[PDB]
Design a protein around this nucleic acid. Sequence first.
RNA 1: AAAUACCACUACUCCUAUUGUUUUUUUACUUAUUCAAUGUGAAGACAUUGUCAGGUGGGGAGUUCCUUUAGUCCCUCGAAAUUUGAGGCUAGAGGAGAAAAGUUACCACA
Lengths: 177, 88, 76
Amino acid sequence: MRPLTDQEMKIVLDKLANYMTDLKSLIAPLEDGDRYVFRMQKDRVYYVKLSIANIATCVARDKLLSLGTCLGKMTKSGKFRLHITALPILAQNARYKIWVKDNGAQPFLYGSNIVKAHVGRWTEDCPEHSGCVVYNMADIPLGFGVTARSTAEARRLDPTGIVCFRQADCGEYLRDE
Amino acid sequence: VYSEKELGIPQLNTVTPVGVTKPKGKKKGKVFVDDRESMNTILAMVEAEKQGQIESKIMRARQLEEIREARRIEAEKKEAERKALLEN
Amino acid sequence: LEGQDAHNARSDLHLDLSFFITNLYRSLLSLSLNPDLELGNNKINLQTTTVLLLRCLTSVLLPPWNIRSVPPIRLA
RNA sequence: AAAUACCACUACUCCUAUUGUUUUUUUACUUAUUCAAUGUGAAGACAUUGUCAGGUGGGGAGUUCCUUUAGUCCCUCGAAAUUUGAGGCUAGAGGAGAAAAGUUACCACA
């Protein structure tokens, strides 16, 4: 367990800013004079309270397995990745949002990119390769990914046509079972 | 296309200083970023590089000024740490 | 920002009201406990802080555009 | 499991009183302590601080412990009573160094 370095937080915040709007609130102090920090165990990154990290420092390195919320993993090439475990923060502070029907949410739960035939609600003025969190019409966060087209191209796109490329769905909870 | 990290290309001295270079295949001292001021300056850099071109001159000036203020506050924080560890 | 042209300019012009929203949210308490609230076709030059706060809250809670897009967290 | 008559012992649980010890919680006050000033005021028995025993330590400085196996039924600790589990001993097997390194009948691209 170590705190991130300068380049590592540069990369992590680059990813979090590519899919999120506000991060000063993320690193903002709480009412009890405590703050959220970033730590690396093995190769995975973690978002957790400072008090929890300081109380978890007794656990031997080889005996720690989880801490707070896992936001993803650094790769052998030095490139960050986000996870379904990192979803909820993106849901809290998302930049772009796309809502899918049930008949596309079930596909998205099996791991398929959303298409115009399944989308039912949009955010106006969305760039082509933007950051969109995938919800349903009951506003349960289902995933996150990169849009395929901009909003206008999505409107004029064939309904059997990809609009958002999947990057992470809730099904991984059925993988690590 | 191949990476200059893969290739054994020496660092060149330009207007941007090389500084004290670190030897290849050796322990480079990991500097840990944990002060909220340091995350402040890093996050300000990230947000500026993401937002990019702002039409308004005063808006550009204000984002640049908040970057400079984050750097400054980090500077006095480090100076205070230095004084604390040097006298006390 | 509720002017129509500025309304359309929004994102392209990078016009955000978050600082003003936070200022209003953090100043509601002082506005509650200060005395001069009621010692008083115009849209701005209103002599009463009560009606000024009323315009503030109408703008934030019921903006004339995208009424069904207001953040529920801010609402609550 | 244990059988009641007879009479002998000490073992705990729940209450009482005074002819007494300690430990802990709450409240009150300044003498412990903390802060401001110079040619006395406030806070308050809480903090702060110090000494040992420990846990971790990918940071800093220096140099090149547990697990399995077979055995004497040899020793210690825990449990249960008419037996066990964990260590201990003998000698085989496992774990230049935060820079990065090794590997796959797997995936994507070329």
